[PDB]
Nucleic acid binder design. Structure first.
Lengths: 63, 134, 384
RNA sequence: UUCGAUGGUAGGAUAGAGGCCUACCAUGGUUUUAACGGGUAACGGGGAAUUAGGGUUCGAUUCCGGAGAGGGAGCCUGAG
RNA sequence: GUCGCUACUACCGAUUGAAUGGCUUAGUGAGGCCUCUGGAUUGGCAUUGCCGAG
RNA sequence: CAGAUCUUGGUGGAAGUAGCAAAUAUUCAAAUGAGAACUUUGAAGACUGAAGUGGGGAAAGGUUCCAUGUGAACAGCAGUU
RNA sequence: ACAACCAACUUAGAACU
RNA sequence: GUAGCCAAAUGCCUCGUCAUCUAACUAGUGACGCGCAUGAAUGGAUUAACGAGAUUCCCACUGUCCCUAUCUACUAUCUAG
RNA sequence: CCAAGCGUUCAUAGCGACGUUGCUUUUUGAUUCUUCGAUGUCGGCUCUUCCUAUCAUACCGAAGCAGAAUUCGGUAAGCGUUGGAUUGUUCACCCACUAAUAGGGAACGUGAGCUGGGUUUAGACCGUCGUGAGACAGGUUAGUUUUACCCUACUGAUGAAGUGUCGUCGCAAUGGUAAUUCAACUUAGUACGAGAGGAACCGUUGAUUCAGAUCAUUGGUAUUUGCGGCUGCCUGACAAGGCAAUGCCGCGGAGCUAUCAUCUGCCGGAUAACGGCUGAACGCCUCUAAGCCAGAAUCCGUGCCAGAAAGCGACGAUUUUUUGG
RNA sequence: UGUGGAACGGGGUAUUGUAAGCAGUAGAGUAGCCUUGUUGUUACGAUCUGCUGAGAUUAAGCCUUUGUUCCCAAGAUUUGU
């Protein structure tokens, strides 16, 4: 019983949420929803979008 | 095929006439799915296979001695997402398979790329010759 | 040639609209006189569906002692009030009701079932019967004794407390629930003692019990043969449409057979689904309704934002694995199983490890408002 | 001569000259005295066999120089 | 000189010819190296900013 | 005359049924009038978008042109047009 | 041999985003 | 019977024989010809380009299909005429 | 039916000529009884039902150590009988899967269901024949597939009341019905067997086909025109908007939907083949002569769907001081 | 006339992705004037940064509400053991 972290949006992923994508280089990515998965497929960076936790951490949002 | 037991039902993403990459080092690259073992009788339904199945395939690209013949093969990866008993939907970046014999032993020696856990648990030879498992 | 199986089953015929909505018990469990006096059915309302993560206890399985995620259906089951008793004789023409005895006072909820315009009416439903109960106390006993000596089959009349549910309907659902104890005299005495009394869901069903859910499926209106019976779509070249059946019949017999797929009603039908396992009988008076032994969050059985088109469950509820017929907020009938369950899957105890309480109104990712506040920190509407 | 082929200026790199590399400026350099490409069952030489003379053939191999340590590529140590 | 039978030699040839090795085109890219960062840890300075490093 | 897929005329069931769905689109207020979804005025929203749903001609038509009145018939709904 | 403006459309290149 | 052509739009036997192609082809192509009944201006062979001509195959592509599902407008539906 | 026999030897374990008795013919034939004031023509697709002359599944009977295979042998049509290359073709031959890929009828089932690949005779080419117009055991190419709005049938949807009226809760006469098959594993290296070999009652875990539902998750769908972005033009500019018969793109809740997702899918009786019991006659003997047991995916039932709209039961109040009961 | 309904508003829940406006020399650079500049004065400049997890939508088949404003105690037809 463990809650994972989305690879793109960085949000908590409970069991039965999102999907799992295994790339050709043996790297496993967890997407919390289709929006994050589609954006990753579209090659969007999670550090660019303002709603991602990675962006907030890199831009000191919250202090 | 009396290898390690039973496999849970999973979504079929590789019907007949599907071209998939060859993950072993036998010299093939274009495994062309011809038929699937264990397919029942149903009108108009194309026999389709998922990871861990025992499809029949021919080689379209690769070493000439591997072409113009039918050989057993095992699907190790598929692009179509399937869910497990834990409620996790997973899929791979490509559809891949390895040439085997009717007993299930791999014709090659090494497997390139990740392998499905269902296929690895079903076939001990593939699990032995594989590296990263999901 | 090219033989293929039939499209659909000729057992759920006619494919017409159901003549009812509550859903009726077509066969009560066989009565065992040795067992204690108990009810064989209950009524609830479907609130929605959610997740369940549990550890499997099936020896010999690949998923033994492993995590499995299963869909469950939540049915809100507030206590039902018993207001009457019906006795059934055993004539060679079937079961025949002999007489019905009602309680002294019937609530507004059950009394509204007898009216189509409640407010416009004078509400004089059980007036002379109430007067008879108050000032005679002899005819009620006479009828109860008649049910005691005759009427080998005894059923009580119970109505739901729909006012405790977040439903706009004020008309309660009234249903005959069979009593399958023994000593028909004791059955009548039990009914008399339970007159105007509330029977709870935990007194009728228990944990890990296999039951049957009875209800009317979702209405879908008319539908073509392609979706009504699963027939093959005709080719794109087909003139005058393709979502049909090509050959409806042959020559002599010069009639359309009853076994041929035809367009028509494809929903709102009475169905009984067998072998539904009770995963949790939760009470509405505790704050740990949705908590488990492995997840101690103080949360109740309701997604944040409420159940979609239902509301908040504030009463006792029953969680059933899988799906049940009917849309949300429809009244469902829970019936005790007529079979015997000796399989390991049926007898396996179920210990829930985590219950999903995330919003079903979208791609919810938080289980509690406290967790949402912790993740989001403080917002613009929170700083000022 | 593209992605340096010929030359000038300036710079970088090298222990050091140098298109070794970079930016710009000119279209230059070789060749029927065979350039270039291809083959070589070609490591090169001192040398060996035959011996009128002239020549022909061989030379992996005891001496000298070059290359390699299964095929490439990169790097530390160390004057090397 | 044509026609012969045979062992064997060579040529062309549909099969959009196959099978190795150098020379290049396009794509991707292990590895070590140079450089920009990062300061668990060592920390002299209840204290608290400064010399510092792999 | 009961017939001739008879002749002429009238009239039925089908039947208040098939149907009156191409060409993007109408809305508000006022006037008139017995009667306004179709008339007129104003406002709004739109289309044709110069090889036009614009302005003229040849052939053909013959008064359809204009004004004033009418709403019996036609304008397959309506009408004060 | 210089040169104060008016009146013109192209083509090529660079940086940034 | 040529300086030719063919199981050809011309071959009944015939799904002719050999090879290629495919996992599998009575299809297609390349060769053979005692060719029932090919053949030289009743024109024969080859042929670049061209063809809304016929035919075989490959890549890309896709609801043709596995296996159907969802959406929009106009009908069908009901109403006034 | 017959038996000379083959069948190392044993006449019908398996074959069994010559004759003879029959059934069917979906093969073409024979005839011309219906139709020429007109019954649309093959194949394929789709869909339902029926038959057994049984491929598989269920249960029985035989030979040889088992184990397998054969007799499909005996009942049995309940339930299944596939994906492709070729041919318009049916037939037919191959590539595979599968337990198996059985054979037929229904106006050689099925064109106001589709398609038009065959036929398709109007245009055109070739081969043969004819002087010619033209002809064909022939080959090839292009060639309009109309109408239901009537009755009935079928699928669904309303619906009047003489038995009071209006409602609530019920019974079930009758009609329909549903589940199917496979794999692996502890029996175990067990029984059996000189050795080698290798089961099975049963249970467990899964899976195929089918059926009924459902939308917690995942996928799809976009008129949520919800949010954001983009091009051309227009409202003087920003902003905010409009048009481009839904302008385009990304995401997109809700709903719908997916063997693209999830859940669920029993046991009682009577039997067929066949095996037994007491037991005679025919003093022996034998399941049968009377009767009683066991016995199949068979049949009828439990269960599930509908509910006689002219089958029925129980219960509630019986137009309020106008008037009616 | 009621633990009433409706229309709004609030909160929650969801979708999208950081609204307009202001400010900042952050911005590749460009152009004029003089005390002549290790934050130059002046002006323009795709874009970027901070207010801003912002703004917008949120039932139309989401939940909730103690908030505000209205509405209902009506009308017509039929019904007798």
């Amino acid at each position: 019983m463990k809650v994972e972290v989305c690879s793109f949006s960085g949000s908590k992923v409970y069991p039965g949420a999102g999907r799992l994508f295994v790339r050709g280089d043996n790297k496993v990515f967890r997407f919390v929803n289709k929006k994050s998965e589609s954006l990753f497929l579209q090659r969007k960076n999670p550090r660019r979008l303002s709603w991602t936790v990675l962006y907030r951490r890199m831009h000191k949002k919250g202090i | 095929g009396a290898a390690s037991g039973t496999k849970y039902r999973m979504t079929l993403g590789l019907p007949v006439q599907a071209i998939m990459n060859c993950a072993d080092n036998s010299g093939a690259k274009n495994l062309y799915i011809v038929s699937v073992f264990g397919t029942g009788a149903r009108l108009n339904r194309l026999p389709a296979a998922s990871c861990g199945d025992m499809v029949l395939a021919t080689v379209k690209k690769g070493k000439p001695d591997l072409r113009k013949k039918i050989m057993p093969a095992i699907v190790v990866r598929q692009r179509k997402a399937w869910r497990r008993k834990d409620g996790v939907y997973l899929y791979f970046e490509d559809n891949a398979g390895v040439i085997v014999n009717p007993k299930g032993e791999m014709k090659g020696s090494a497997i390139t790329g990740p392998v499905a856990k269902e296929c690895a648990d079903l076939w001990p030879r593939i699990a032995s010759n594989a590296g990263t498992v999901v | 040639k090219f033989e293929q199986p039939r499209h659909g089953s000729l057992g759920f015929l006619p494919r017409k609209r159901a003549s009812r909505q509550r859903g009726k018990v077509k066969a009560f469990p066989k009565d065992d006189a040795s067992k204690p006096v108990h009810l064989t059915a209950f009524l609830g309302y479907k609130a929605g569906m959610t997740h369940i993560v549990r550890d499997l206890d099936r020896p010999g399985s690949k998923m033994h002692k492993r995590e499995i995620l299963e869909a469950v259906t939540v049915i809100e089951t507030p206590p039902m009030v018993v207001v009457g008793v019906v006795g059934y004789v055993e004539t060679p023409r079937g079961l025949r009701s002999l007489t019905t005895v009602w309680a002294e006072h019937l609530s507004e909820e059950v009394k509204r079932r007898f009216y189509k315009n409640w407010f416009k009416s004078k509400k004089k439903a059980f007036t002379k019967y109430a007067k008879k109960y108050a000032e005679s106390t002899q005819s009620i006993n006479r009828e109860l004794e008649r049910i005691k000596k005759y009427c080998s089959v005894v059923r009580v009349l119970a109505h739901t407390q729909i006012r405790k549910t977040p439903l706009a309907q004020k008309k309660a659902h009234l249903m005959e629930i069979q009593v399958n104890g023994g000593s028909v005299a004791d059955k009548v005495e039990w009914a008399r003692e339970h007159f105007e009394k509330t029977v709870d869901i935990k007194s009728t069903f228990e944990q890990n019990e296999m039951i049957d859910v009875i209800g009317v499926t979702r209405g879908k209106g008319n539908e073509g043969t392609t979706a009504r019976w699963g027939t093959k779509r005709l080719p794109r070249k087909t003139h005058r449409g393709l979502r049909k059946v090509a050959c409806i019949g042959a020559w002599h017999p010069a009639n359309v057979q009853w076994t041929v797929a035809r367009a028509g009603n494809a929903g709102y039908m009475h169905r009984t689904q067998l072998n539904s396992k009770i995963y949790r009988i939760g009470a509405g008076d505790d704050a740990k309704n949705a908590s488990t032994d492995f997840d101690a969050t103080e949360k109740r059985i309701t997604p944040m934002g409420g159940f979609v088109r239902y509301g908040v469950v504030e009463n006792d509820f029953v969680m059933l694995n899988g799906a049940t017929p009917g849309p949300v907020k429809r009244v469902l009938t829970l019936r005790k199983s007529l079979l015997t369950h000796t399989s390991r899957k049926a007898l396996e105890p179920v210990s829930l490890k985590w219950i999903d309480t995330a919003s079903k109104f979208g791609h919810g990712r938080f289980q509690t408002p406290a967790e949402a506040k912790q993740f989001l920190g403080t917002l613009k509407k929170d700083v000022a």
